[PDB]
From a paper:
The [name]-dependent protein kinases ([name]) belong to the family of serine/threonine kinases and are one of the major intracellular receptors for [name]. Next, two cyclic-nucleotide binding domains (CNBD-A and CNBD-B) are followed by the catalytic domain. Binding of [name] to the CNBDs is thought to induce a conformational change that activates the kinase by removing the autoinhibitory domain from the catalytic cleft, leaving the catalytic domain free to phosphorylate downstream substrates. To understand the overall architecture of the [name]-binding domain and the molecular features required for [name] binding, we determined crystal structures of the CNBD-A of human [name] I bound to [name], [name] or in the absence of bound nucleotide.
Author numbering:
A (entry chain D): 92 to 218
B (entry chain A): 92 to 219
């Protein structure tokens, strides 16, 4: 009758980094534990090498990311806004407020991320 | 019980200029009209004389501004980035990224602004 969310096995310390990264993000410090637990179980791993463009400002959004290793640079209109380290969320705006990517994310080093797709996250709001 | 956002009574003209500034921001046009209203109500007035620096690059962010009157010039690392007048929103970037101000805003003539602070600004974005 109702949808089933994909489940991705994780190390307990991965699980811990994701959660805490979520609590750290301004626009998600309002989520119920139950809901954060559902997010944590739903992210999947993705790696990018250095000099990689993950998010292009203007394109549409479908993935929200938590960074486990590495360091990324954020730019809007060729302007360096800031850099981001592990334990930080990003690419959340276009998923929450259904807009287009507000800036571009390039990698500086190799990075390992967690990512959750459009569909899954929506469902986790219906709580 | 949740928190209670402050109310700032406003001239209809102003309540409308602000709605304009917001709808013209290249990110905030995507907000629900309710959220836009809640914002409008939470803005409050600030005045600056000319040759004054409102936002300094590298600083911690706290306030988003809308501009009612005046001209301001946005810069960075010494370089100019654009003139700017009434109806525009600025200072959204540092809030949208829990990072630091990315530019330096200075007046050019006497200016008048509306300002929402970041706690209000985010409390509003957590809806519906
Ligand atoms: N290249 C640019 N063109 C126009 N406005 C800008 C530019 N860069 C920054 N700003 C504005 O200037 C503000 C300076 O502080 P913020 O980064 O918080 O938000 C910024 C934007 O509102």
């Amino acid at each position: 009758s109702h949808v089933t969310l994909p489940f991705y096995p994780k190390s307990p310390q991965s699980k811990d980094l994701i959660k805490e990264a979520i609590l750290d993000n301004d626009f998600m410090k309002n989520l119920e534990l139950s809901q954060i637990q559902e997010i944590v179980d739903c992210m999947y791993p993705v790696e990018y090498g250095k000099d990689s463009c993950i998010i292009k400002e203007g394109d549409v959004g479908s993935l929200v990311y938590v960074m486990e290793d590495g360091k990324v640079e954020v730019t809007k209109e060729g302007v360096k806004l800031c850099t981001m380290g592990p334990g930080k969320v990003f690419g959340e705006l276009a998923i929450l407020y259904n807009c287009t990517r507000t800036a571009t994310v390039k990698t500086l080093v190799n990075v390992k991320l967690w990512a959750i797709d459009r569909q899954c996250f929506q469902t986790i709001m219906m709580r």
